[PDB]
Amino acid sequence: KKFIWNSEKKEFLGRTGGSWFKILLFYVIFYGCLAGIFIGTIQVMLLTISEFKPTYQDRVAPPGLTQIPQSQKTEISFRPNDPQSYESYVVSIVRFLEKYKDLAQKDDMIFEDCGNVPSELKERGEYNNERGERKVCRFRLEWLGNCSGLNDETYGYKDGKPCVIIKLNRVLGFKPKPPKNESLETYPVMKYNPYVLPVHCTGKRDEDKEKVGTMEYFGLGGYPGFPLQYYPYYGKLLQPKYLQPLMAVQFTNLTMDTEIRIECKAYGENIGYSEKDRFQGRFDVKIEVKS
């Protein structure tokens, strides 16, 4: 109790009141000047980077291929007969697809219609505010064959025909370049459009290649990939409502109640792969329709 408090000199926990206030005021001016100098250095640092282009981009290169809906461990297993076993996947698919409906792309100043078929890239110019906002190449959900959220809300999950929409990682200032016909001898057979960046799904093992079934690729203009006309991306400062190109894949005639790991891989000059990061350029999805 003596160290806790002593009434002789009014010392609380070890020190008197006068010293308590002295150190409190000193620590306030000190920590205040320290946080102030910290914020000052932070602002001086912010005054170095640009607002529409990052000072370093090598860390996001090449872009990474992603799939929708985001599923834990990339495993998509559900009971086709069960109306709720696939509710999560459809819910996450719709949460993202609603941003591509014809209703969101109404304003003509922000949303502009781009070629219905693969065309040349729409280079907007320079990364500045001289022209203010930039138009966004509209993308109708109808470009997706049977899984668009327009005719079939289940997207195929109700009849054991999943549709895993594929997406390309948005990177500012990236100009995709599809592989040339001259070197076309290793990647599988697919439509060769020099104005589309292709993607092809394959199995992973000898069992996967047999039990996958029939791939049905859906994309703009019927080409298995992303049209080059939707790049480059200018960031959230110049194109806030920018919509990235999409493409889906339907897995019909697949083995029931069996886990199958498929890998969809994107090809191109500026699209690489990695041994440690299994999501850079390609991705693997595990499915099992346990009816």
């Binding site: 990052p54 996001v60 990682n169 991306y233 960031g235």
Partner: peptide, 22 residues
């Protein structure tokens, strides 16, 4: 480790190992 679409301040998408390297 599965949300491989982290949106940065500029709107770019990062993977898991890509951002873990940073």
């Amino acid at each position: 480790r599965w949300i491989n679409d982290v949106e940065d301040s500029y709107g770019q998408q990062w993977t898991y190992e890509q951002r873990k390297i940073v």
